[PDB]
Design an enzyme around this catalytic site. Structure first.
Site, short mmCIF file in Angstrom:
data_model
loop_
_atom_site.label_atom_id
_atom_site.label_comp_id
_atom_site.label_asym_id
_atom_site.label_seq_id
_atom_site.Cartn_x
_atom_site.Cartn_y
_atom_site.Cartn_z
N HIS A 45 43.07 -26.67 74.13
CA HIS A 45 41.98 -25.72 74.00
C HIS A 45 40.98 -25.81 75.14
O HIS A 45 40.19 -24.89 75.36
CB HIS A 45 41.27 -25.84 72.63
N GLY A 186 32.30 -31.02 74.49
CA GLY A 186 32.24 -31.62 75.81
C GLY A 186 33.06 -32.90 75.85
O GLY A 186 33.41 -33.39 76.93
N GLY A 189 39.42 -33.17 74.67
CA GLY A 189 40.40 -33.50 75.70
C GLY A 189 40.34 -34.95 76.13
O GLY A 189 41.31 -35.47 76.69
#
Ligand SMILES: [Ca+2]
Length: 240
Positions: A45, A186, A189
């Site tokens: 994403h 933020g 990932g």
């Protein structure tokens, strides 16, 4: 990272900052894990948008020169074929980024240790989430890399009604949920570093938090379970 502390400059050398170009400047949007000198593992994403991305390794303070940074462009983005942007709960939130050039390894830039395929952590296993994500729900990015201690919550418990229920899949790792500490926008990932047999390994790729907020009791941060994608990862690297 909500409820975290500033990480020491050389604690998590595999952590990278994924940034996108905005005008004449760059903006941090996600974290990632360096797994090869020219490959970064992150969340699918994080790279859904049609943006120009760059990877920064050896990063610590997003607003000041640390004298350890290496900036590299993204040459190829391989998202997992089953990833569906409008169904993060389905899983497959993982992507590999081939870098334009191989980064140099040193005290601040190291390859992340990945767990053996199929490995599942026992409940309440010691882990740290790291990242420059928001320090509060709807807050702002951390200037310096943060870390938060987030013990795992096994699948049986995490998939129960009081927690995430059916939203969480076996292909995911849950950690935290104490209502004080968590990942936040933020951090996506980025890595979830867990201690196993004396060695920290990246067991998760930060995927999502509750729409109610980042640090929500019994809504632990959810990560893509890295050990469920070892074959996929090797397949991509070997054919790219
Ligand atoms: Ca810096």
């Amino acid at each position: 990272v909500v409820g975290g502390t500033e990480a020491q400059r050389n604690s998590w050398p595999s952590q990278i900052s994924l940034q996108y170009r905005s005008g004449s400047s760059w903006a941090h949007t996600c974290g990632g894990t360096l797994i090869r000198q020219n490959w970064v593992m992150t969340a699918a994403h994080c790279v859904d948008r049609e943006l120009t991305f760059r990877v920064v390794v050896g990063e610590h303070n997003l607003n000041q020169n640390n004298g350890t940074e290496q900036y590299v462009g993204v040459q190829k983005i391989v998202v997992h074929p089953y990833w569906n942007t409008d169904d993060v709960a389905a899983g497959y939130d993982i992507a590999l980024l081939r870098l334009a050039q191989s980064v140099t390894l040193n005290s601040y830039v190291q390859l992340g240790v990945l767990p053996r395929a199929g490995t599942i952590l026992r409940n309440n296993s010691p882990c740290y989430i790291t990242g420059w994500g928001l320090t509060r729900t709807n807050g702002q990015l951390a200037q310096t890399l943060q870390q938060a201690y987030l013990p795992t919550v096994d699948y049986a418990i995490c998939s129960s009604s009081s927690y995430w229920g059916s939203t969480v899949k076996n292909s995911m790792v849950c950690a935290g949920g104490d209502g004080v500490r968590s990942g936040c926008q933020g951090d996506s990932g980025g890595p979830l570093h867990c201690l196993v047999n004396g060695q920290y390994a990246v067991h998760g790729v930060t995927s999502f938090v509750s729409r109610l907020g980042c640090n929500v009791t019994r809504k632990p941060t959810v990560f893509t379970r890295v050990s469920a994608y070892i074959s996929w990862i090797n397949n991509v690297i070997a054919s790219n």
